[PDB]
From a paper:
The formation of amyloid filaments through templated seeding is believed to underlie the propagation of pathology in most human neurodegenerative diseases. A widely used model system to study this process is to seed amyloid filament formation in cultured cells using human brain extracts. Studying templated seeding in cultured cells, and determining the structures of the resulting filaments, can thus provide insights into the cellular aspects underlying neurodegenerative diseases.
Numbering used by the authors:
A (entry chain B), B (entry chain C), C (entry chain A): 277 to 377
The structure:
């Protein structure tokens, strides 16, 4: 057996994944999650009197509120968010999340 | 056996995936999730008196509210969001999420 | 057995993942999570009288509130957020999260 490799690679694996994003306002509220997953390989070669301009755009997020009025009560009442029971275990009994009786 | 490789590759795998995104406002609210998955390979070669301009556009997100009025109560009442029971386990018994009795 | 490699690679693995992001305001509130996952390989070669400009854009997040008024009570009442029971264990009994009786 002869095993030979040149690994000159670029890898992103399982990146930026399985995020759980919740925004639950009463009112007048902004949530921004800015999560690009970017893999860039750039090999600019410039001889003689050439020019290379490499200026790809980035992400822009703009939120503008010019006027916002709430003239009466802003109220949130949350008993729960996001109840989860995972239980990959073998032989478990009476496993409970958010039990009301 | 002879195994020979040149791995000069670019890979994104399982990136930016399985996000759980919830926006549950009473009112007057913005959620922005900016999540592009971008793989770019660029090999600009510029000889003599050439010019290369490489300026691909980025993402733009703009939200503008010029006027917004709520003249009476803004109210949210949430008993739950997003109840999940996964249970990949073997022989489990009486497994409960969000049980009301 | 002969095993030979050149590992000249760039790797991001499981980066920026499984974040649990919650914004639960009464009102008038901003949450920004800025989490790009970026892998950049750049090999600019510039001979003679060439120019290389390498200026790819970054992320911009702007939130502007010009006027915002709440003229009455802003109230949040939270019994819970995000109850979770994991229990990958063997043979556990009477395992409870957020139990009300």
């Amino acid at each position: 057996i002869i095993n030979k490799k040149l690994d000159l690679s670029n890898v992103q694996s399982k990146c930026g994944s399985k995020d759980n994003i919740k925004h639950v306002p009463g009112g007048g509220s902004v949530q921004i999650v800015y999560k690009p997953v970017d893999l860039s390989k750039v090999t600019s070669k410039c001889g003689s009197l050439g020019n290379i301009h490499h200026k790809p755009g980035g992400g822009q997020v703009e939120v503008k509120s010019e006027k916002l009025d709430f003239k009466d009560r802003v109220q949130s009442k949350i008993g729960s968010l996001d109840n989860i029971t995972h239980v990959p275990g073998g032989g478990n009994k009476k496993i409970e999340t958010h039990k009301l009786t």
